[PDB]
Every structure is written in structure tokens, then in C-alpha cells.
Symmetry: C6
Subunit: 170 residues, 6 copies
């Protein structure tokens, strides 16, 4: 069990090597059988590892979060808990009834007070890709269903038994 989790860390993720401010996209497979608590541990581990919002730096970066396969009932409720625990994010909807605004995701990438970025669906994700100009890397962790990632994006796909192992690899 612990040797299965060791090979996935070293082969694909390379957490210590990669520190440049890249538009890193973390696509996670949210299902009904997994609970919100384990998703929040994965989100907190992704943000704490792949963002640098320290005051000393001059090139801050924040990760991008995308979830698929789940309903909007627990996707919005996970979003509601995360804002209550002072993990401030953006998703391109700064007010109620807004259209999707990629610029709010762009400014939140360099904003030190915004910890990560949420992406609601696939159409928000594809519209975000054409708006970021800097280098983008896509990391996907999934259990059953994968996602159609554009072929010109540097992509990795990682298969896990369930959602609990993702926070170790990240």
C-alpha cells in the first residue's frame, strides 16, 4: 500500500523540482461516493504545496482547481465550506448573475490574498485556457472517468483507487 503511493509521487508530480509560477491546473474527479471532508483535505494539500503567496516573493502563483462528475448540490456546498474557512478563491463569477469572467481568474493567479482558483465546469475551463498566456500544466487525478484535455497542453493523468490517495501524491 505504502509502496504503491511512493511510485506515483516520484514519477509524475515532482513537487520539489517545480517551483516556477506556472498556471497549474489540478483536475479532480469528484463523485457521490466520496465525501466533502476528504476533498477539502486534498484541496488544502494542493494549495499549500503548489502556491507561493509569501510576502518576500515577486512572482506569486496559485493553483487552478477543477472538479467533474459530481452534482452542483455538493459542488457548491464544498465551495461554501471552503470560503468559510478563509480559503479565498475565485471562479470568474464575482457577483450573482455574472457571466464567466476569465480576468478574475487571471488577477487571482498573481493575487497574494487569493489562495487558489475554482473552475465550475468544462466550458469555464476551456475559456480559461485561451485567456492565460503563460505556460500551463494540467494534472489530472481520477478513479473511473477521465477528461478530454486539449492535446496542445502538457498533461499528466494519474489513476488512483479512490480520492484519499490524491493528497499524498500532491
Amino acid at each position: 500500500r505504502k509502496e504503491y503511493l511512493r511510485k506515483l509521487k516520484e514519477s509524475f508530480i515532482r513537487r520539489s523540482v517545480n517551483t516556477s509560477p506556472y498556471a497549474r491546473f489540478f483536475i479532480l474527479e469528484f463523485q457521490d461516493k466520496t465525501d466533502i471532508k476528504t476533498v477539502k483535505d486534498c484541496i488544502y494539500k494542493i494549495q499549500s504545496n503548489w502556491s507561493n503567496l509569501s510576502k518576500r516573493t515577486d512572482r506569486p502563483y496559485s493553483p487552478f482547481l477543477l472538479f467533474h462528475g459530481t452534482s452542483d448540490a455538493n459542488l457548491y456546498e464544498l465551495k461554501n465550506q471552503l470560503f468559510n474557512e478563509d480559503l479565498i478563491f475565485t471562479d470568474g463569477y464575482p457577483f450573482k448573475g455574472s457571466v464567466f469572467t476569465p480576468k478574475m481568474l487571471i488577477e487571482g493567479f498573481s493575487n497574494k490574498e487569493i489562495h487558489f482558483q475554482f473552475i465550475n465546469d468544462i466550458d469555464d475551463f476551456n475559456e480559461t485556457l485561451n485567456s492565460i498566456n503563460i505556460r500551463k500544466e494540467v494534472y489530472q487525478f481520477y478513479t473511473e472517468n477521465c477528461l478530454d484535455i486539449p492535446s496542445q497542453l502538457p498533461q499528466v493523468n494519474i489513476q488512483v483507487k479512490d480520492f484519499a490517495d490524491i493528497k499524498e501524491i500532491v
Copy 2:
């Protein structure tokens, strides 16, 4: 060997630092009548030293939350009296005699560098301060015979220990 049981329990549930992030860490230690007072104090001092950052260099300080159960109030209050005389300054939401539970005193003491940790008297004050803390809260449980019930929405670990003495090197 006994060094291996400590090494397994130190890594299976507990992490060494949990990234040193300011989190509402709750340490629930199951105090018995058979457990000596001073071996609880060694566990409290080890928990406070490892799981708080009260240095002046930081701008995001944090302090652990301590809860004890399974023991009477006679030796529970006796433990709290000794910890105050040894300059281990804590708070429990009771700033004066005949006070109601003030969970905001635990909120300020979490960010206070002069308050080393936060004491929680019992279950009713434990659930009251759970709804007063908005930031991420984690519960660490160290029990021998009796395990408390934690709300299912919190990240919790439950670690069985042979006695109270081996809790000190796990944390």
C-alpha cells in the same frame, strides 16, 4: 520492539508538522483516574511545543486546543492549577468566576502569542467552540479505553495507546 510501535503510530495518523499551517488543532487526550498528573503535563508541554508557533517573526500564529475526558473535575482542575503556576498560560472561555462559556476568548487566545494553548473543559464547551472557529479545524484523539464521539464533518484521527506515557513521543 516498543520502538517500532511508536514509529508506526507516529507516521500512520499523526504527521510531523502538518505543513506548519495555522489550523484549529484539537488534541483530545483521555485522562483516567489511574493516570498520574505529571505524565499528562509532559504530554501537554510536548503538544504545546510542537503544535504552536508563538515566535515574534511570524504574522500567522497558532496554538493547540486541549480537551480531556474520562476524569473527575477534582484532578482536572488540579492539573490546570499547576500549569498556570509554571507560566504555561492558557484560556478556557471562563475569564472570571461565575462566567458563562465565552468561546471568543478561545478565538483570541488562538492568535495570541502570550497564550500558549487553549483548554476545553468538557463536551458542551467543545461543540460550542467548534461553531465559533471558522478556519479549518482538525481533531487528534489519543485514547486507551474510551473514545469520544466527534462530529463527522471534521478531519479526525483516532489513535489507540497502551497507556498515557506513549502519547508524548507520538506528537
Copy 3:
């Protein structure tokens, strides 16, 4: 096993720790029209991030020189347009449209911190550039099938790889 091949090529010729000095390092890759622009940009980003010191602390900055051969100008200009759009600012000796090759831009961009690396369009630009840098120059050539003819007075190492993807983790 299988990863011992990549470890041996890393240890044999190309070491990052001892090469902290500002030399005019030339990196030559074999674009063979069968690898896409994705794996080329991963190799360029890894070469640039390792083999340049554009930090504001240092007073002797340096940037690598990048040369590609064996490919058409359609996907060479396609690769160059993507790199400039991704804020990886480079110079190729052509500061404006219709310009002749100006090697002084590659001289200035070598010591410039906002210029990340230097592009070389073809072999004729490469030979003209080598007469412009006075300080010590090294040539690192990575290729699969076709090897360039480097002049003999330069310190050169040649690395053969199975495909273009192995160059990323070698450097």
C-alpha cells in the same frame, strides 16, 4: 532496469552543480518533425530554468543559447511564436522584420535578465554567432538520428537519445 540509462547520461557529461559559471552555453536539439511542439517547449523550459541565472542578486547573469536543426521553418516559427506568447522572452538576432542577422542582440541578451534565452535560426547564424562571443563557449548537442558538425576548437559533448522526451530530464 530502465532508468539506469537516464542516470548514466546525466552523470557522464552534463552536471548542473559545478556549472554555475557564466559561460556561453549552446544547446543544440534535433527537431525531427515527428515530435510535437509540446515536448520541445518542455525541453526549452527545463533548459532555461536550469542553465540561466537571471536573478537580481547576481551581478554576472547568463542565458543559454538554443539551436534547432533538421526541421522546417513552418514549425520552427510556430514554436517561436508560442514561446513569446508564454512570456519566455528571447532574441534571435532579428530585432525587426527584414533585418540582417545582428549578433549583438545575442551578446546583449546573454547578459540581460529580462531575456530568458537566445534562439539561433540556422547553422549560418550559429557560425556567425560563435565569432561574436569572446568568453568561453560550450556546445551541448542532443540528437537522435542526425548530428551537427561542430567546429573542433569548441568544448563539445554529444548525447544520443531514444527520443526528444529524454532530453528534458537529462538537463
Copy 4:
């Protein structure tokens, strides 16, 4: 080998553990007649070097407390006189000749950066010092044949060594 029995003793029974913390650490060593003066001084210098922090950077200094038993007063005062000659300044609660025991001098000497450690003469001076200290106390006992009686409310560790020379490497 002889290094192996002290290696497990240097880590398991006693260790560095919680250090750079201003605790009232009491070191109790068995000074005997067969143990000469020189190896006691090498043990005292090693205890002072490791278990005190008197640098000007800190604002929470601490110094160890030294207690000796099982020896005559003639070679106890000979050891105290030689340590004071080599600028290892200590206090024993007797600031002048014919003074009663003043534990306040050991209160100030514990936090004094210019006072390297604290001396305790016998058991009556040790018990009265314990009541005067309010902060956390730990008793580190090193003995060969006879072990001193310590109050049970204190954290105690007992080390039985083959001779006094092993104490300087254990501590």
C-alpha cells in the same frame, strides 16, 4: 562495545528532545571519593555547554542546576573553587560569607547570561530551591551506586553508569 551501551543511553533514557526551552533542568551527579576532580569538571563543562543557552540573540535564557552527593565537603569546595577560577561563574545561593541560603540568587542566575550554571550543595538546598522555582522542572539523575531520593511530583530520569567518565558522553 563500550560505545554501544552509551549510544542507546544517549538516545533512549536521555536525549536532546525538547531543548532550547527555558526549563529548570536539575542535573544530579554522584561525586564519589574514587572519582577524581578532573573528570567532574569535564562533565560540568559538557552539561553547561549543551544544556544552557546564554547567547545575546535570545531573550529567554536558561542555565542548568548542578547537585552533587556522596562526597565530602573538602573536595566539593575544591571543585567549586577551580570552576570559579576558570571563569565558569555560578551561584549556590550564598552570595557572601556567613549567608543564609538565598534561592532568589538562583532565580536570577537561571536567567542571567553571565552566570553559566547553578550549584546546589546538598539535599536541603535542593528541596528549598524546588519550591522557589515556579517554572517546569526536570531532574536528570546520574549515579553509579547510590541514588538520591527525588519528590514524585517532578519528572525524573535515572541513569546508572559504570563510572563517572560515561556521563560526559551520555549528556
Copy 5:
């Protein structure tokens, strides 16, 4: 194998770690007509980078002394002209054409941060300068077929190499 005897010749003869102090370190290489100028230049760049500390932070700079023997003056001057063109500024005691040997120029260049190393032309200039440095000197000699007769009061080490390529691995 080749990587085993390389480490044995590296570790035993030359201790890289301890020698950080400013001593007048003389490096003697056995330049042959069969040895290419490019392979010599990599050894000089490796010798200079490892054995000089000309940073602006320090106050005790030092540079290695370089001596070559067994080769003609045609390629020795060609090697010296190539190193000066690559901004590897050296001195050799001949500040102008027709000058006599000035060991004082080698003395000033030893503490000069703008001068990277010191060239010595032949044996007679090597013996003349040895009476001019007063501080501690060491002679490191690398040779393949012909060895020099170093004066016996100097700390000398002699390394026999198969060819000139592995000298830069030792330094």
C-alpha cells in the same frame, strides 16, 4: 574501473574541502604537443574556478599559479592568447614587450580580484618567483611522462595521469 581509480587519485592526492585558505598554490601541468589546446583550457578553467576566491565579500583573495612544461613556445603563446581573449585575465610578470620578469606583478595579481590566475612561462621564472611569495606555498604537479624537480622545502604532490583529460576531473 576508470571511475574507481579516478576517485582514488582525486581523494588521496588532493583534499578539496579543507584548502580554502589563501596559500600560494602552484599548479604544474605537463603540456605535450599531442595535447590539444581545448583540453588544456578546460583544465585551466577548472583549476581557476575551484582554487580562486575573488568574490567581493572576502578580504583575503587568492589565485592559483599556473605552470606548463614540455611544450613549444608557439602553442604556449597561442594558449595564452586564447585565454586572454575569453576574459580570463592573468598575469605572467611581463607587463610590456621587452620587459624583464617582474615577480611583483605576480605578487599583486595574487591578491587582485580582477586577475583570475597567474601564468608562469618556464622553470627560470618559476624559481625566481618562489623567492618572492613569502606566505605558504604548495606545488601540485600533474604529469604523464616527464616530471619536474621541485625544490625540496616546498610541500609537493605528484600525480601521474594517463592523459590530460582526467586532470580536470581531479581538480
Copy 6:
């Protein structure tokens, strides 16, 4: 192997990591007229570099004391003359001709950052300067045939070496 014998002798008695202190360290070496002058210099230079801290940052400088026995005064004065010519400034309590032994110059030279080490001429000046240093004094004795007699109140160590060249590896 032979490299073990240097490693056991180094690890058993002399540790650089554990001392790091302003102690009056005495290094007594056996100059026995069969080793030439030059190998004593690398021994003295290694002892001075490893066992002294004369940086401007520190407020507590220290320099080692060195004593040579068993050799004549012709090569002992000859060794002293080369060390002073190589800018290794020392003192021996004789600031002028006709001076009596002044151990004060060995005291101010101990705390002097311009005095690298202290020379002891013979056993008469060694015993006299022992009573002049108030601070803790340690004696390190390296010998091959004849061992000097050390007073029993000092921390002394005797290392038996095959020859003088192995001493600089131990220190």
C-alpha cells in the same frame, strides 16, 4: 585497511564538532630530528586552521598553544623563522632579545586575532604558562617514541602515531 587507523585515532579522542569553545588548548608534538622541517609546517598550519577562531564576527577568539620536544634548538629556531616569514604570526613570551619568559604575551596573544598561535619553547615555559592561564586548559599530546610528562590536574590525551605525517590527518 590503513585508512581505518587514521579514522579510529581521529574519532576516539579529537572531535571538532564537540569543542567549539575558547579553551586554552595545548598541542604537544614530538619533533624528533628524523622528520624534516617541511612536514611540521603542514601539521602546524592544520592545527592553527582547525583549532582557532580569529574571525571578526566572534567576540571570544582563541588560538592553540603548540609545544615541541625532543629536537635541538637549531631546527626549532629554524622552524620558528620560516613560520614567521610565511605570515603565520605567533608569540612565545620573548618579545625581545634578553627577555625573560613573559606568559602575559601568551595571554593577550590567546585573545588576539592577529596572533595565529602560541609557541612554547620547552618544559620550563610550558609549566610556567600553565599557572598563568586561568581558563580551562586541555592538552593534546602526539608522539612517536618519547611521551612528555603532563601534570595530572589537566585533561590530557596521548595519541601514539606511526610518524609525524599522520598527525595532520587526526587534527
